[PDB]
Design an enzyme around this catalytic site. Sequence first.
Site, mmCIF file in Angstrom:
data_model
loop_
_atom_site.group_PDB
_atom_site.id
_atom_site.type_symbol
_atom_site.label_atom_id
_atom_site.label_comp_id
_atom_site.label_asym_id
_atom_site.label_seq_id
_atom_site.Cartn_x
_atom_site.Cartn_y
_atom_site.Cartn_z
ATOM 1 N N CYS B 46 -5.711 6.958 -13.662
ATOM 2 C CA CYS B 46 -5.092 6.246 -12.089
ATOM 3 C C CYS B 46 -4.032 7.168 -11.401
ATOM 4 O O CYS B 46 -3.537 8.068 -12.547
ATOM 5 C CB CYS B 46 -5.288 4.767 -12.861
ATOM 6 N N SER B 48 -1.479 5.626 -10.682
ATOM 7 C CA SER B 48 -0.194 5.920 -11.162
ATOM 8 C C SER B 48 0.419 6.888 -12.401
ATOM 9 O O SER B 48 1.540 6.138 -12.780
ATOM 10 C CB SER B 48 -0.933 4.122 -10.871
ATOM 11 N N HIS B 67 -2.891 3.113 -19.173
ATOM 12 C CA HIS B 67 -3.369 1.793 -18.887
ATOM 13 C C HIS B 67 -4.358 1.355 -17.776
ATOM 14 O O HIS B 67 -4.731 -0.254 -18.839
ATOM 15 C CB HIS B 67 -2.437 1.111 -17.998
ATOM 16 N N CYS B 174 -8.022 -1.137 -14.617
ATOM 17 C CA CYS B 174 -6.960 -1.642 -12.661
ATOM 18 C C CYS B 174 -7.783 -0.572 -11.926
ATOM 19 O O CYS B 174 -7.997 -2.198 -11.283
ATOM 20 C CB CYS B 174 -6.150 0.301 -13.526
HETATM 21 N N1 LIG Z 1 -1.205 -1.724 -6.924
HETATM 22 C C1 LIG Z 1 -1.794 -1.459 -7.762
HETATM 23 O O1 LIG Z 1 -2.045 -3.026 -8.429
HETATM 24 C C2 LIG Z 1 -1.366 -1.056 -8.372
HETATM 25 C C3 LIG Z 1 -1.360 0.411 -7.199
HETATM 26 N N2 LIG Z 1 -2.601 1.509 -7.069
HETATM 27 C C4 LIG Z 1 -1.894 3.025 -6.337
HETATM 28 O O2 LIG Z 1 -2.656 2.633 -5.664
HETATM 29 C C5 LIG Z 1 -2.801 3.978 -4.676
HETATM 30 C C6 LIG Z 1 -4.029 4.763 -4.828
HETATM 31 O O3 LIG Z 1 -4.330 5.272 -5.661
HETATM 32 P P1 LIG Z 1 -5.917 6.189 -6.380
HETATM 33 O O4 LIG Z 1 -6.789 5.353 -5.407
HETATM 34 O O5 LIG Z 1 -6.179 6.075 -7.730
HETATM 35 O O6 LIG Z 1 -5.343 7.141 -5.630
HETATM 36 P P2 LIG Z 1 -6.462 8.445 -5.384
HETATM 37 O O7 LIG Z 1 -5.465 9.571 -5.619
HETATM 38 O O8 LIG Z 1 -7.359 8.597 -5.832
HETATM 39 O O9 LIG Z 1 -6.682 8.265 -3.640
HETATM 40 C C7 LIG Z 1 -5.659 7.818 -2.083
HETATM 41 C C8 LIG Z 1 -5.772 9.114 -1.588
HETATM 42 O O10 LIG Z 1 -5.231 9.030 -0.891
HETATM 43 C C9 LIG Z 1 -5.661 10.152 0.356
HETATM 44 N N3 LIG Z 1 -4.528 10.374 1.186
HETATM 45 C C10 LIG Z 1 -3.800 11.205 0.887
HETATM 46 N N4 LIG Z 1 -2.336 11.305 1.591
HETATM 47 C C11 LIG Z 1 -2.824 10.899 3.027
HETATM 48 C C12 LIG Z 1 -2.533 10.401 4.565
HETATM 49 N N5 LIG Z 1 -1.727 10.850 4.970
HETATM 50 N N6 LIG Z 1 -3.421 10.154 4.780
HETATM 51 C C13 LIG Z 1 -4.750 9.110 4.247
HETATM 52 N N7 LIG Z 1 -4.659 9.471 3.565
HETATM 53 C C14 LIG Z 1 -4.217 10.176 2.480
HETATM 54 C C15 LIG Z 1 -5.809 11.093 -0.674
HETATM 55 O O11 LIG Z 1 -6.314 11.812 -0.167
HETATM 56 C C16 LIG Z 1 -6.833 10.193 -1.960
HETATM 57 O O12 LIG Z 1 -7.872 10.174 -1.282
HETATM 58 C C17 LIG Z 1 -2.294 4.915 -6.067
HETATM 59 O O13 LIG Z 1 -0.826 5.265 -4.738
HETATM 60 C C18 LIG Z 1 -1.653 4.118 -7.047
HETATM 61 O O14 LIG Z 1 -0.466 4.391 -7.722
HETATM 62 C C19 LIG Z 1 -3.284 2.052 -8.084
HETATM 63 C C20 LIG Z 1 -3.612 1.319 -9.202
HETATM 64 C C21 LIG Z 1 -2.994 -0.220 -9.275
HETATM 65 O O1 LIG Z 2 -1.731 1.304 -11.428
HETATM 66 C C1 LIG Z 2 -1.171 0.938 -12.237
HETATM 67 N N1 LIG Z 2 -0.526 -0.077 -12.096
HETATM 68 C C2 LIG Z 2 0.294 -0.350 -11.047
HETATM 69 C C3 LIG Z 2 1.035 -1.096 -10.163
HETATM 70 C C4 LIG Z 2 1.900 -0.710 -9.523
HETATM 71 C C5 LIG Z 2 3.070 0.057 -9.336
HETATM 72 C C6 LIG Z 2 2.889 1.135 -10.024
HETATM 73 C C7 LIG Z 2 1.705 0.813 -11.547
HETATM 74 ZN ZN LIG Z 3 -3.854 2.444 -12.503
#
Ligand SMILES: NC(=O)C1=CN([C@@H]2O[C@H](COP(=O)(O)OP(=O)(O)OC[C@H]3O[C@@H](n4cnc5c(N)ncnc54)[C@H](O)[C@@H]3O)[C@@H](O)[C@H]2O)C=CC1
Ligand SMILES: O=CNC1CCCCC1
Ligand SMILES: [Zn+2]
EC number: 1.1.1.1
Lengths: 374, 374
Positions: B46, B48, B67, B174
Amino acid sequence: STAGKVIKCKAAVLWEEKKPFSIEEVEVAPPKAHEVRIKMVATGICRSDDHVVSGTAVTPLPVIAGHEAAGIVESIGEGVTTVRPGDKVIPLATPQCGKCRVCKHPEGNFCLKNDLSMPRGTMQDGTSRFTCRGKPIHHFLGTSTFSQYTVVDEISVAKIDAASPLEKVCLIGCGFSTGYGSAVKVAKVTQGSTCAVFGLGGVGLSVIMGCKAAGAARIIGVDINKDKFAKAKEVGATECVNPQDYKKPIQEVLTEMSNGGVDFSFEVIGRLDTMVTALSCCQEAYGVSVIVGVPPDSQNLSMNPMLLLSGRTWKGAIFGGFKSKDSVPKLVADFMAKKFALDPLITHVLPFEKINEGFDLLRSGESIRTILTF
Amino acid sequence: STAGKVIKCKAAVLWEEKKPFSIEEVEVAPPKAHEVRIKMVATGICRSDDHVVSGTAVTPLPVIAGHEAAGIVESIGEGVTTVRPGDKVIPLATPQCGKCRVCKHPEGNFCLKNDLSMPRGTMQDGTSRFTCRGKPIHHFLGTSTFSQYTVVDEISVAKIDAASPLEKVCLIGCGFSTGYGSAVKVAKVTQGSTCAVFGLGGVGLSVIMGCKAAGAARIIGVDINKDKFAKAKEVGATECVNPQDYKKPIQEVLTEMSNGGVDFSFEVIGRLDTMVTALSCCQEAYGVSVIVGVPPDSQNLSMNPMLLLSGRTWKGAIFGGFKSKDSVPKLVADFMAKKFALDPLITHVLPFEKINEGFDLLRSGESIRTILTF
Ligand SMILES: NC(=O)C1=CN([C@@H]2O[C@H](COP(=O)(O)OP(=O)(O)OC[C@H]3O[C@@H](n4cnc5c(N)ncnc54)[C@H](O)[C@@H]3O)[C@@H](O)[C@H]2O)C=CC1
Ligand SMILES: O=CNC1CCCCC1
Ligand SMILES: [Zn+2]
Ligand SMILES: NC(=O)C1=CN([C@@H]2O[C@H](COP(=O)(O)OP(=O)(O)OC[C@H]3O[C@@H](n4cnc5c(N)ncnc54)[C@H](O)[C@@H]3O)[C@@H](O)[C@H]2O)C=CC1
Ligand SMILES: O=CNC1CCCCC1
Ligand SMILES: [Zn+2]
Ligand SMILES: [Zn+2]
Ligand SMILES: [Zn+2]
């Protein structure tokens, strides 16, 4: 006697920012198609009116301000179908055209015909109905109630019950409905919850009335003017805190008081720092914070988005979320049925000619709502 | 054979920020009371986890990250009642203690026992179960799945169906659940609505899946990597836009496409400037924007509160708003009944020993989810 003819009457003209209102004779044009000319009976002094004087809110000058009011229809233009001469009415600072995407949405109320997003200070047709000393005078939010007569568009006026006490229900035109709906409709306060209300003026007292009506168990009033606390407890606050009494930031005080954060917080002041504080003091995983106060023009706040990522909900609303033309008559009917009280908000009643004394009362902290009578 | 005994196994240790993981031998202590030792079977990469490497998400180092995973219980400590040896399990990066004010609240899911708000990098009892080169190693979010064996607290593990395909359902730990729940549960996307999804990685594709499941009529994917669009369309996006293609800011572009703003927007990237853009692109009077992406540690965004005063709702959530221990088994059951698909998210499969190659795939933009097999 006056239908179809220009009316000369007195109004309070604001020619510049940071100046007293100028009580003088103005000329009020007759209503055009789908316009309504209203003789004012009472108008409240809302902090948003003072924001125009202080520069906090920018709208074209010179202007006839005033927007929380009640009056009687003097004449109607071609095509008006929703009110008639002799009707008691309340002007709507947020209109309800009934045809835009927002008017049609079940929850939305910020009609796209509003004059807030892009202030023009005119009628819907782009012109003004006010003249003073030969100069055109701008309108305010399509209402302009600091005048013996005003002209509004049909979508900015609601007919109300003919037995209404206009010197009280003018508050339903802004202050009461804004605070009350912010609690019962926007936040949707739940029964037994803990609420924090920042700002104990007319609108914040109405937020407290709504939190109490929704059945909140604790209602914490926050104000730096401790003279506001007595009335706040009378309308439902369980406890009041003054930030200047503490060494600690007040968000930290509220969190400790609420054993980890409040369920609902309301910012009803208009300061960037208190918007962030109100958000922070609601519980991080399920708290809801509502912005009601108006910040200084064009200023950005700064906040850490982790406050939202943990689960908080942050929102704001105009006019308590109420669809204005639908809700104002029902609120008046509710008032009449004693469903809520307006007298606790009214601390002063003055003749219209003492408008400046009314704003001095507000700025000095001595009043809640002053009602000006015509 | 190993019950009650220290297990020596291989894990990916992060000794320093911005360095490759070191695959080397660690010692995993046996579980204490109410702890569970798990033999890992599969773990996803992930974003994160990469945030730990880059310093975007701060947690004490050195650390065993990971995780998003699934495994099989090797042994249980004294007092464990919810899982037994041989059970298939998913570790929960957000625990569900079932006793705190959040766990008892009907909407909340950010259990107060989490290790995110004030990271310690330990078990619930404040100690570590990992040793490497004789030194204690920190845990990550009470899970630490980049290891052949880990030890978690009982409130951070859920028993799942014994027939579960662990190399797919690890994503329910996740990425999938976060995106899916952010749409169906946090935003509560409505049927026929228009959605905008910023970021088309594993989590953003899961948001799209949730928007489609909710009956959205339009789902606009936004990414600066146009290679992400094909898969976004396969899982439900009706249109994709690359901000780099336009001479104007994308919120203006999305406001024009949606004839005045979208119903629901999602930030699923982790940038301050796209969180404000996503909020701005929803309907000013009734739009809802959900922050899902993780911002760089301790950085503040800057925004004009008039964006909220008009009526917008802004919120964020961890793990899609799901109460983790209640929800994970149900989600696995729904996956086995083909209520949603995980194969579209899995683009690469590697052995655990090639973890650094898997992070290179993520950083270069080529992968959605790489699943590591032990
Ligand atoms: N709230 C929560 O519980 C969770 C939050 N997250 C967070 O969510 C986010 C996404 O995670 P993933 O999908 O795994 O990441 P990822 O990196 O695979 O996807 C991110 C996407 O955003 C795009 N991107 C980057 N900069 C950009 C911009 N300026 N404009 C438009 N698009 C842009 C990238 O090209 C990429 O495709 C991460 O920040 C992660 O840490 C992830 C899992 C759980
Ligand atoms: O990706 C899993 N958990 C995340 C939730 C948002 C803060 C960073 C860790
Ligand atoms: Zn995650
Ligand atoms: N969203 C909407 O639809 C509406 C918004 N408003 C806005 O709501 C706000 C309040 O309006 P009123 O009640 O009429 O104003 P008010 O001036 O009567 O009340 C403001 C209160 O805030 C307190 N205060 C000031 N600074 C403070 C601080 N740092 N900490 C704590 N308390 C502080 C004052 O002591 C005062 O009691 C104004 O900003 C007004 O423009 C008003 C009407 C409708
Ligand atoms: O008080 C009445 N209306 C207000 C609504 C918020 C912006 C300033 C004007
Ligand atoms: Zn007002
Ligand atoms: Zn409208
Ligand atoms: Zn809990």
